[model samples]
Target chain A: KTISFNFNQFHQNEEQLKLQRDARISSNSVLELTKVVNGVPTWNSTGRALYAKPVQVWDSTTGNVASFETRFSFSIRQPFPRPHPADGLVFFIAPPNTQTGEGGGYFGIYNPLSPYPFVAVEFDTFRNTWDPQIPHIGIDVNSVISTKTVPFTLDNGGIANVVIKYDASTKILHVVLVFPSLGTIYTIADIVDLKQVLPESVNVGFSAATGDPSGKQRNATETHDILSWSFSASLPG
Target chain B: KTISFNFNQFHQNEEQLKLQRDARISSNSVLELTKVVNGVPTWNSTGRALYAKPVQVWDSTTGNVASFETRFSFSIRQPFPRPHPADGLVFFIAPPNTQTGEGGGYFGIYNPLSPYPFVAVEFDTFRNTWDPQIPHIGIDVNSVISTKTVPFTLDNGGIANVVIKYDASTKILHVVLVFPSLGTIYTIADIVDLKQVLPESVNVGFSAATGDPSGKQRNATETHDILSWSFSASLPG
Candidate 1:
């Protein structure tokens, strides 16, 4: 079966929240998710923060899911002459029901000490120690580090179309990054064995983060609105 | 006779130099300065600093003239989910050509200390020590200090329209702040005795500054295209 949810009907305060549910599929199954995210900080009192709720799309009874396709579209407000640290969103496929902590700074979803997830697609806006110069779209394993990647020339201030596809049989995680303004698509891959880490039975979701330490600087948290989604055992076949 | 200068054929990143044989006007003689200031900052490593050749707008023949109007419209892009100290733009009725110095960091137009034949109307973007709470629109005397002002609820990151008028006869300066999104006009003022400051005459021009030492913040120093201008004197016809 396929399920979906939209986050725009409610007030778009920084604290707004939304989620969805889908019937559990067998171990050798697949699901697809698509959404669009756009908006600025709702209030000035609270700077934007990187935050997202977990998606529960797994049924322990189904054993495990084999593959999934996730797609997302997001637009930016052009470029600020003096850009703040990159602000970005992430599509997460995590272990069922594991709540990623909460409160200030880093998202509690991922373990601060180690790469917590088996597989994650990251659309990073800001530059960290690992990548400091440009914006990037990558498939990250374990946690924040990139396993497969593509660098974007437009920086993290503009809109983008991103797609991540997983094939259990081939164990290949493919990523496609597109800059609509330039009419270009950059595709890349990761050879990591996904079936081993991403159990056939797992949950799916997304998250966003804007790291700003109080009075230091104002964090323009990514305002996201999920449009729609559909999932099945490989295209409902 | 009314004198005018036109800059419609200049390209971005390239500078234009010209000598106006009669760019100046005599005291009690009106000199209408007309030219559009480009809103988009041409790609310059220095950031939001746009450069224009200095003109001897006021000649010794005419001691000083008044009644001038300056208006500017431009777009902004603050993509990040944060607030950067964006330095705004300013219009100057500075001293003669002999004293015009280097242009950077607050345009050396205003006297850092002493004051004589110097007056400026500034559309400040970020807040400063004088008033650190709200974004301001006001007039800066010989320095950055706001002599008169008004708080503005300008969209944190977007396009804005501003107009400032100076009346030498009334000794009054009025500023009108317009937000196209809301279709409303916000008026503020600063009372300065222009004739008393430049009994002989004053030069009219524009300047912008964006630099460091104030802590890192996202600041935009750009514009799409500076529009138009019209100035008239009260001599004979």
Candidate 2:
């Protein structure tokens, strides 16, 4: 039976618990996200800078034969009147069914070092030596930089909502961006499957980096807050 | 022998050390008057709701001609594109030699308990309990909750310059608002001095508040910062 759940009510049935666990495991696979504190924004500055923390999941993730969807909404407090650099905020999927370290400098556990069983969905905030306008949401495989599609506008200085979907059957990835104030959504990428490019069942999450001295605001230190989040994945058939 | 010092040089003099001391004392006084920290604007929350740290003059007493000219600039970090409560920020000149502990609500330290020895030059950000539609730069005596005069426009979210001249000879207070962007100055108040109305010699400084709650985007806080300042009084020759 196909079942749905609310993020706030997190725990209930055993079936729900399994689904929640999967979502948590996938989300917790790799992370280097920062939150605001003491009126200032801070990030984890450790080895490789690939840090991720797990919070209580609002829903159960156990079930079979289902589709999975995940959403994250955050607000970027713009201190100045201009847009900042391209340090992307991304999502990732990896394996070992446990955890591993991703290289640093914007590459979470999915860094250049450990490349297998990893799927990354990137919200490129800065333009790198590769990529266009440093603007584009893509799926990267292994230790290589590969892209599916690029978004037209870059995240300058404002709040944005990001959504990612993984279809288990087709193994395809779909990404969407919603500009709330403007009431618009841009489908930056669609049908991107990582299994085709990388060998190994993947885990899901995100990674970001701030590079390039020109063409973007210097994001030496950037601050953003995730107000709400929700994610779902299909039950293994 | 007489000593002549330029306001700029007096502000930057290295030898007098006394000038540096006086300037430090004066600047520190204003900085301690009120402060805006980490997007949160805070004032001394005890005896007085509003107050100005007194300026210490070395050579003059009551109406002993002292010429003080300084540029007061403040930043209201745009929390959002919202309207201010009352007419936004304001500047005032209180009796220079009095303790700033007695002012109530909008009045500074001179008349904390009652409206005595109070004369203010205000740049109303929004039409509050006193004015309407038009943002103005005006002079008020005692309380604006009762009496306020309208002079000119000083709207938009940016820095504004206010200057007040007190003529001990005529016992007159003159107020002017200069919009640097437009290169325009408006004579806000002419010939209104508490020295002429009060029974004793008065002090001068600044005090600000917000009141109007209509036709403005609601904002929770307001901010004020004074950049440069200098006050000098001449003894009767």
Candidate 3:
């Protein structure tokens, strides 16, 4: 399996067409994962922006899984320094039709009360009971409870560079999160067989949510913008 | 051989001391590698900025080599669309006391007429006789003629994300350059035993040069600025 695609800074007509948007991912002159509106980031700010086309996750004939990697430049920003910028985002892989689920801690990728199928590398801003209670990075397998986690900070909504690679042979997912302005770098790796959880083909995209744990003064309002994204993949021949 | 260092941005007093600066690396309110001066940029625009402290590249007692990786955010800009913006910069490792050499194609990493020693990952903006001539990336060992070269564009001075890793176990140097604005990422790797070419411990830094083919109207006048840098290393037990 081989595939490659890139979005320098979305908003192009072709790019919008290729995106399988769902939930609160409203159309805008600029492309972003999520946004805040009316002082309340939004009652239902959960959103997912995915590739409309399906990518081959495995080679059926050879029974070999594909290895994929992606690099993206993004920023988590406060809307005019609004309070309660809860939760963050995830670069996720899910069954073709997977849609946004819950907001808040779930990052629109998972819903404990509903059925879901996905594996994700999460850059979580707000911590939940299960989270370490700090800005963190985690690997999730169909659940918000991460299998592995490492500490990281968004540096009060600074720009971030993120890269994630999944090796089919090792079943290891390696992640690197860099915040240049803060002089911080976080590297974490997790082992998981996608074939056991996901299908032979899947959609890849981003999920984000901004929500106050108790729905406080302002139910979390942060602008999550994806400045750029690039993806590439090739499997064992 | 555990070592970690990072510089979010230069220009700080402490940050400057940590840098072993030389040649045309003039101080500015803003931190940058090299810059243009006057209309001609500058005839002798050669510079080197490096970490003053020596890093353990290999474990002498254990007879094992350490692997090191670095990430940096930089940009190369033409001075007001200067006619000739020649040359680029290098992330290099050299013997202690290494200083700026000849300007132009040498990139200050090597001096053909003089004795020089260093290994470098070059982000070449100008094309020379020995170069592919189409903005390129190269791995240089002791000389400007790269052992391996890959095509890459600096994107007319747009921001670039660079990561270079040297693995002692595989004797390979892997490079990834990302241009988020251009939606381009170049990955290149080459095998080279650091111990064989570099000392057990060495000073690591950057080198850059600007030149015209024959010192014409402007001998390569581009602003090479390093916005941020982070490094990490660890040897095999």
lDDT digits (tens) for residues A1-237 of candidate 2: 232333322222323222211122113221124433454433331111111332221123432223456776654443432354335555665552434343223444453454455556666644455666555666665532655555646344455666665544444355656555553345433344443443333344444433233333333334433444566554443
Residue B69 lDDT in model 1?
Answer: 51
Candidate closest to the true structure, highest lDDT: 3
User: Which is the winner by TM-score between candidate 1 and candidate 2?
Assistant: 1
Model 2 misplaced regions, further than 4 Å: A1-32, A35-37, A42-66, A78-86, A96-105, A152-157, A192-203, A209-219, B1-237
Q: What does candidate 3's lDDT look like per residue over A60-159, in tens digits?
A: 7888999888999877776534444667888999888765687888888776777678999888877688998667899899888998777876765577
The most accurate candidate by DockQ is 3
lDDT of each: 0.45, 0.41, 0.73
Candidates ranked by lDDT, best first? 3, 1, 2
- In order, the TM-score of chain B in each prediction is 0.64, 0.58, 0.88
- Compared to the true structure, candidate 3 yields what TM-score? 0.61
Q: Write down the lDDT that model 3 would get.
A: 0.73
For model 2, give the interface RMSD.
29.6
Angstrom error of the Cα, residue A191, model 2: value is: 3.8
Q: List-wise, what DockQ does each model earn?
A: 0.01, 0.01, 0.06
TM-score of chain B of 1: 0.64
